[PDB]
Design an enzyme around this catalytic site. Structure first.
Site, PDB file in Angstrom:
ATOM      1  CE  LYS B 161      -4.152  -1.711   0.073  1.00  0.00           C
ATOM      2  NZ  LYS B 161      -5.176  -1.345  -0.947  1.00  0.00           N
ATOM      3  CG  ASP B 189      -4.071  -0.730  -3.984  1.00  0.00           C
ATOM      4  OD1 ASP B 189      -4.361   0.356  -4.532  1.00  0.00           O
ATOM      5  OD2 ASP B 189      -4.938  -1.532  -3.573  1.00  0.00           O
ATOM      6  CD  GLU B 215      -5.409  -3.119  -6.443  1.00  0.00           C
ATOM      7  OE1 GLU B 215      -4.482  -3.869  -6.046  1.00  0.00           O
ATOM      8  OE2 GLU B 215      -6.573  -3.183  -5.989  1.00  0.00           O
ATOM      9  CG  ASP B 240      -9.764  -1.797  -6.244  1.00  0.00           C
ATOM     10  OD1 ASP B 240     -10.907  -2.271  -6.419  1.00  0.00           O
ATOM     11  OD2 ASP B 240      -9.208  -1.781  -5.123  1.00  0.00           O
ATOM     12  CE  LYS B 264     -11.305  -4.389  -3.091  1.00  0.00           C
ATOM     13  NZ  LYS B 264     -10.615  -4.086  -4.370  1.00  0.00           N
TER      14      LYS B 264
HETATM   15  N1  LIG Z   1      -4.812  -5.789   7.548  1.00  0.00           N
HETATM   16  C1  LIG Z   1      -5.961  -5.914   6.895  1.00  0.00           C
HETATM   17  N2  LIG Z   1      -7.101  -5.979   7.579  1.00  0.00           N
HETATM   18  N3  LIG Z   1      -5.957  -5.974   5.563  1.00  0.00           N
HETATM   19  C2  LIG Z   1      -7.147  -6.108   4.725  1.00  0.00           C
HETATM   20  C3  LIG Z   1      -6.796  -5.897   3.253  1.00  0.00           C
HETATM   21  C4  LIG Z   1      -8.023  -5.877   2.350  1.00  0.00           C
HETATM   22  C5  LIG Z   1      -7.695  -5.840   0.850  1.00  0.00           C
HETATM   23  N4  LIG Z   1      -6.429  -6.578   0.602  1.00  0.00           N
HETATM   24  C6  LIG Z   1      -7.637  -4.396   0.325  1.00  0.00           C
HETATM   25  O1  LIG Z   1      -6.567  -3.776   0.288  1.00  0.00           O
HETATM   26  N5  LIG Z   1      -8.793  -3.879  -0.095  1.00  0.00           N
HETATM   27  C7  LIG Z   1      -8.912  -2.526  -0.645  1.00  0.00           C
HETATM   28  C8  LIG Z   1      -8.495  -1.470   0.394  1.00  0.00           C
HETATM   29  C9  LIG Z   1      -9.475  -1.309   1.544  1.00  0.00           C
HETATM   30  C10 LIG Z   1      -9.046  -0.830   2.783  1.00  0.00           C
HETATM   31  C11 LIG Z   1      -9.925  -0.709   3.857  1.00  0.00           C
HETATM   32  C12 LIG Z   1     -11.258  -1.064   3.701  1.00  0.00           C
HETATM   33  O2  LIG Z   1     -12.113  -0.962   4.777  1.00  0.00           O
HETATM   34  C13 LIG Z   1     -11.717  -1.536   2.479  1.00  0.00           C
HETATM   35  C14 LIG Z   1     -10.823  -1.657   1.405  1.00  0.00           C
HETATM   36  C15 LIG Z   1      -8.084  -2.370  -1.922  1.00  0.00           C
HETATM   37  O3  LIG Z   1      -7.711  -3.420  -2.489  1.00  0.00           O
HETATM   38  O4  LIG Z   1      -7.844  -1.217  -2.355  1.00  0.00           O
HETATM   39 MG   LIG Z   2      -7.141  -1.744  -4.614  1.00  0.00          MG
END
Ligand SMILES: NC(=[NH2+])NCCC[C@H](N)C(=O)N[C@@H](Cc1ccc(O)cc1)C(=O)O
Ligand SMILES: [Mg+2]
Ligand SMILES: NC(=[NH2+])NCCC[C@H](N)C(=O)N[C@@H](Cc1ccc(O)cc1)C(=O)O
Ligand SMILES: [Mg+2]
Lengths: 354, 353
Positions: B161, B189, B215, B240, B264
């Site tokens: 991230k 990302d 991303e 995304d 998603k």
């Molecule tokens: N540590 C932890 N809980 N990680 C969860 C990661 C979720 C996924 N890999 C992700 O990054 N999803 C979204 C970002 C995101 C962040 C917070 C919330 O509440 C929802 C989505 C993404 O891929 O951009």
């Molecule tokens: Mg993403």
């Protein structure tokens, strides 16, 4: 579940009448019928209907290709339709009739294993479908005469072939319209017979004849021309030969070439691909009609019916191949009785045997 | 088979660590869990995990919407997924978490009735999936340290991230690569954090660091700016937030906006819509990655995994939400254990409860 063996046979069924369209004529439904046996004993049925003047596929070539596919998928699970298509696609760069025959038998097996009629695995929207009935090219009075007959059977929609000349074709439709009424829906199919500007002229000529839609008015490869027509008339234009697979569909919705798209399992290589086409079309706001080849029978029509009934966006059906067959190649499935309502029972898979 | 009743309840689960991305932080995984019971006795599990800074959905709104959906599908066959989505779409113009909740429960019921693991009904390509693990935004040295930790857990792909400034963001990635070597795949990302030019600048600056893909580098609505990035760098670009549903996907393919698309279930309204997105992408030669919201639990993650394993074109996976969960709301399904391999058993449907 695992595929133990794949058996394929030729099937030749005499047609009750010689069918004629702008592309040619046919008098016998010759197809390839597949039976896929699993290690546990279940047997799925499939069919490949080759249309030399539509897809270029032949029965000889289809039989050969299916045999190559059959040996390549022994040991695979019928539910792994993703890999099964991967395998066939690596083997042949083009053979929708062969691929559809394998594909259909796999979905039949899936239904039988899950113990569910096929339409329940494909969307479950409905358990029946209403089909039109086609009228092959002939004299204006001859076609008009046959219309009354079909209507008498209960058909509310008639598919009319044209393509000898804008002149005679217009005479054909008119003759038929003021012959059966105005409560009967009339769709026309010119099988690529007209040039862009002649198509427009021909279509507009039937303005007061209330035409539901016109199918493939120009050459399949003349996409700019097809879009020309679509964009010149308010009448609904449908693409058939211009759309075989999902990639074609994507291109059409992309360019905004037509209003509706005709899907045929024998053009796209089976239900797996037909689903893609319909999904692409629905997403783009384009409805789909499920069609058929003159050379396919009970198995192919039944497969198409389950798909059509299952998918909401497949809003029209042209599944009349069994109505012209002299005898049924199998037991069960869509009957050969010429009727508009095709009701799918609760039998698992395609509900076909013998 | 017919739906007898629809039960829905709130689930608030603390995360073991606050998760930070460019859009904000998340401290708890609050989701709506649905149980669809059929007249015959089979019960399907579903979940709606709303991400407010992604879709704007809230738990309260998702619960009210699910309730509206629930009382409208009584008597319908779970296999009639076509009508179930038609009904929900007529009720609400936008509620992907609520729709996903109902949708997932229905597919769970389909699997159970057919007596088949869900991945068998959705394509059957595989029965397992390998996921990456995401590292939340932090200091370069810390993220690098956390990276080595995850690699020790067996992860061969890390989702990094970034998004506080090209300066720091570049430092984060450099540090991470230096710590784990070139044997590990690194995908970035930015969660819309960069301008199109800063994006090209940052990506070009990391050319020698072997970046697998980047991303969503720019704002969700800035499609022209997104395509700009994609046509200015050799690095694979993934959408995304720019892609929620099938219509968005069709728009991106039409414009040739990106190279890969992140799917998603909580963005598109469930498996039914996710399948459309993947088929559209596959047809256009665009591969898809299955992702997740931080707010999802075993239910959402398990459904996503079954879909990913089932479809050939879903070549990547970022299903790591259960790794940050303090507790699991149901038994079965993908465990809370932080591991790259997610093996789906032979239990019917989701294989939950
Ligand atoms: N540590 C932890 N809980 N990680 C969860 C990661 C979720 C996924 N890999 C992700 O990054 N999803 C979204 C970002 C995101 C962040 C917070 C919330 O509440 C929802 C989505 C993404 O891929 O951009
Ligand atoms: Mg993403
Ligand atoms: N009763 C009867 N003659 N039925 C024929 C059904 C044909 C179907 N509705 C159809 O029009 N299919 C193609 C045209 C076509 C004609 C002949 C062959 O062998 C293959 C295809 C179409 O819709 O264009
Ligand atoms: Mg046609």
């Amino acid at each position: 579940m695992k595929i133990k063996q794949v058996h394929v046979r030729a099937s030749k069924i005499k047609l009750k009448e010689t069918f004629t369209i702008a592309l040619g004529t046919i008098e016998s439904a010759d197809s390839a019928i597949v039976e896929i046996e699993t290690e546990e004993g279940l047997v799925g049925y499939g069919e490949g209907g080759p249309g030399i003047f539509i897809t270029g596929e032949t029965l000889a070539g289809t039989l050969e290709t299916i045999e190559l596919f059959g040996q390549a998928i022994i040991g695979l699970n019928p539910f792994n339709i993703e890999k099964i298509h991967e395998v066939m696609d690596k083997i042949s760069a083009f053979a929708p009739a062969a691929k559809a025959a394998i594909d259909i038998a796999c979905y039949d097996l899936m239904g039988q294993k899950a113990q569910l009629p096929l339409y329940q695995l494909l969307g479950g929207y409905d358990n029946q479908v209403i089909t039109d009935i086609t009228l092959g090219i002939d004299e204006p009075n001859v076609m008009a005469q046959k219309a009354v007959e079909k209507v008498k059977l209960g058909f509310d929609t008639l598919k009319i072939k044209v393509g000898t000349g804008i002149e005679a074709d217009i005479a054909r439709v008119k003759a038929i319209r003021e012959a059966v009424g105005f409560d009967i829906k009339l769709r026309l199919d010119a099988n690529q017979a007209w040039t862009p500007k002649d198509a427009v002229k021909a279509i507009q000529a039937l303005a007061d004849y209330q035409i539901e839609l016109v199918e493939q008015p120009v050459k399949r490869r003349d996409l700019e021309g097809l879009k020309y027509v679509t964009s010149q008339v308010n009448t609904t234009i449908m693409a058939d030969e211009s759309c075989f697979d999902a990639q074609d569909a994507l291109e059409l919705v992309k360019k905004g070439t037509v209003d509706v798209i005709n899907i045929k399992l024998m053009k796209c290589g089976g239900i797996h691909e037909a689903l893609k086409i319909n999904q692409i079309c629905e997403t783009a706001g384009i409805e789909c009609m499920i069609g058929c080849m003159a050379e396919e029978t009970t198995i192919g029509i039944t497969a198409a019916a389950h798909l059509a009934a299952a998918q909401k966006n497949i809003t029209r059906a042209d599944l009349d191949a069994t109505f012209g067959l002299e005898t049924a190649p199998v037991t069960g499935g869509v009957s050969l009785e010429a009727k508009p309502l095709l009701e799918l029972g609760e039998a698992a898979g395609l509900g076909i045997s013998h």
